[model samples]
Target: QLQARRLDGIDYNPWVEFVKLASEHDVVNLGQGFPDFPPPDFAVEAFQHAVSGDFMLNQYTKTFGYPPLTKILASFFGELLGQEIDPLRNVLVTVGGYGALFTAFQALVDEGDEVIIIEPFFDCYEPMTMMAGGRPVFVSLKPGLGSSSNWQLDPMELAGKFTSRTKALVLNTPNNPLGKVFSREELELVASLCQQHDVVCITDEVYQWMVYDGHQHISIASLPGMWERTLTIGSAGKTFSATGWKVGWVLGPDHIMKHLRTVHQNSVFHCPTQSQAAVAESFEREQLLFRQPSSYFVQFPQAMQRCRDHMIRSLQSVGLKPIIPQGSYFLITDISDFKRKMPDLPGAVDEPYDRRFVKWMIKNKGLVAIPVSIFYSVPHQKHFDHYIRFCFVKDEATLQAMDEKLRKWKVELENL
Candidate 1:
């Protein structure tokens, strides 16, 4: 009752409500993307050391970021840029990718500016844009031939959304919930569009290291003429399998980062110092493993791919055909056939089918997944309501348990 109209209109985060349902039902939680396994031993040890040994780490860091993290990240990512990166000026670390995104919107989007959003997007973008007083223009990614690799963006449709009032476009590579990695060819078009319209690019590259099937994640900022106008965000959680750490950073030219720095000062002030310290040490070790097989970045996806393969096989056995993902920890499966399996309630028509189905699945089936329709806008919700997203990032025990559960579920479905 005390909320502002801006925040009041929006519904609360879905994860909050659904996670509680999952817990109450004791369901297998494939709903959230966080790893159910432990983080790498080295990073854990470093975190322990930071908390136990370093008294300074328990206190405040620089207003923008902890120096060790900003310096390490600037140097590590600098090689990718083939240019020198100033630790203080080029980087700003905050609470998480969530915080970085908030800072970006608050600092960059002005009142009445139109911000382009690619749909089936991370759900926060619309509210974030709204809070910044920016209008979000949406265009959805269309599914292709029922295969994961076939999802395509309409170039003509993309161009139509841009206008003289356009301020920015949000790009997420190795995208969440879809596991669709934007090809270099796709990125080139985005780069050219931004260059032509002079729109700022907010590129989220959290899954930069989680690629599979030899598909590479291309940074839009690295494309020709994009460096000056792009704000590149990456996460330590996704990078090192430590979502609880809640550390992420922004990299861009000083002028743009100057504004985000101002946002950081006024809002978050600084990220947690000890977590930043642990992440710094973790990256320092990761830097040394660049070309070697020992690298965390090199080995993480390989392990994850095996889990993905297991989940894929498990889903197919149950007659749920999953869309194969090229990257990220998520992928969608068609459940349009489940209507006969689900008992229809009269009031269910008010909610999206995917939402109703997912709740029943969690409470009845003891399986948890997110409704893909929730990720889309109101206009396009029904167009792609048959699918649901599952997170496959888990340990061996969890994967095997999921397999057994799915197999049992298949038997139960056949009997019905």
Candidate 2:
């Protein structure tokens, strides 16, 4: 009764419940997206340097961003976006990409305004929109066989969702769960829609560097007439394999960023200084070695691509159908055949198939994955409940753990 009205139906988070379940069952968690490996050696060293080298880093640096970090971020992203980005006016360093997203929603979305969101999304988009008093208007990618690239958005259906009240559209490239990197032509289509509707584009590119299999991560803001209306978000956590750093930045035109700055300044005014400093150093090194063999951006995705193939092979051998992702860390597998082998328990009778299957897998098989249905809106959840998402950005040992378990499970399934 005391909580705010906005918190009404949005308080439940799947991670909270499933993480607890994972711990209790002592399962191998491939559910959440964080890497089970250490950050790049240079990044860890930079953090150590920040901790011991500079005393000023211990205190607050700036309201918007640490000067060094913001300057480097602007330089790096500006080149990528093909625009001269102003560190002070066009960038706002945030707690994480999560914070940047929240600030973007608060700054741009208004009461009753609609925010277009694609389905099989990161799941935070819906709640973030609702928290801003904006309605989340959904458009889903239809599932197809073989590749995540085949999960295409219907062009006319997307065009139909925009209206006079449509304030913004959230786009995630190298998307989570499905790892569908929006093709350049796909981005051009969205750019045209945003331009036509005058809708602001909040492009989350946290998985910017996680692209794989020849798929390029095209920034929508780089498209014609789009930069003026797009808030491009980037994360050091995802970039450096240091999710705990909690350092992220949003880049946009000064007009759009000023609003986010206002929101950021008034709330969570300063992000941690040392982490930003460390990230700045990491980024500086990356720039010096841009696209080189040793760069973390180049190496990390290559490693993840190998891991993705390993996981895909394991799943396929066990009689499961996995959608091969073109980018990002996750792959969704259809669990219909596996479901036929195990009947649902009484307690989970009302739960969706994916949810029930995941719980059973964790409790029995000692492996955990996130249910794909949680990524969909309630009404649409049932349609995709037979699919589950697995994160493949783990260490050799972690990947081995999954492989060993799956191999044993396969033998058991064969006997059945």
Candidate 3:
């Protein structure tokens, strides 16, 4: 049993786990948070250019990252974070967002170290810590009274989790299950605690570009005293919608990055060369048009806002109450209105209530959504089971198709 961790548990991946249920029912698969639309043609064309025109682009490049790619990314985010970044030393391009995080835990977390993960996190943080032989500590996001817009961390509870043995704290803004974008004040609160306890902050900001409406994304790395201690992770998948490219990177100080580089060198040395070249070109172009309306950074969110509204209305049409989201493309809706229809079945394996509800929704209604409870810890599962999450970065046709299904469901909901 060299790998008892993999053997003891079912190795649950909520995205893939629920997608299988959706696929079995042949429902509109909104369970997995992936873009159903094509990425910008400029980015795709860049990859096309790399594949057909450049011979060396296909060959293995630098062990850490392609020099050109990392250079541009460092330059791009350096400006975004308002710091001068050293590409070679501070940046380590990994396989994807997942790879960046996996290597981070493996590299820095010694056995018996504790890593704090915010609840309704990306779902992988807990197991990743365990795999690294680190203890996973958690804190929950409490929803605002009568409003989902007010998700907050209790300062008292947060301060309690910190200790001399605390290794790192994982922060995912525009949080997955809640779609709660961390405010400047909240981030400052976290940064203060991190500095006081001397804990490193691993911030996941893959959805940095997917923020909707008038909300802004504040990089914790940009905060005072955080640059030295925070490692910010980003993805081309969420930025450009080319998720299949699987290009992601980490931005941090050289001392911390050296460890991640060691992990990268030992495992999956050098990400896909062609994809790196392509994404490099994409960023270089965006750099020129950074804040212009034509820029993907400015335009992608404009398109996403409309889609978010469409999903909100669709959820409402089905008589479901949706908690309005401020950022990220995912929408979380309160499904407690249909609790009568979401009853537990006999011998249901003691699963989270929303898991059973989502399975029923996907199977009977031909619609798929992630059960929100799966994103929380065991002690908080039932407390958080009254909602579900669905990604809205989908095609217009998919939204309309889901609405057509929703209208029928609404009628059924009413007749009940």
Q: Which numbered prediction scores highest in lDDT against the true structure?
A: 2
Each model's total of backbone clashes = 0, 0, 0
Segments of candidate 1 deviating more than 4 angstroms: 1-3, 340-347
Residue-wise lDDT of candidate 2 within 54-129, one digit each (tens)? 6978999989999999999999988988998999999899989999999999999888999999988899999999
TM-scores of all candidate predictions against the true structure: 0.96, 0.98, 0.96
Comparing 1 and 2 by TM-score, which wins? 2
Using alpha carbons, what is the TM-score of model 3?
A: 0.96
- Candidate 3: lDDT of 178? 74
Question: In order, what is each prediction's RMSD in angstroms?
Answer: 1.7, 1.2, 1.8
Query: Which model is ahead, 1 or 3, in terms of lDDT?
Result: 1
RMSD of 1: 1.7
Highest TM-score model number: 2
TM-score of 2: 0.98
> Model 1 reaches what TM-score against the true structure?
0.96
Question: What C-alpha lDDT does candidate 1 achieve relative to the native structure?
Answer: 0.86
Candidate 3, 314-402: lDDT as tens digits:
78877678887777768788877677664653326767767777888887889988888878877889688788888888998988889
Residue 48 CA error for candidate 1 (Å)? 1.5
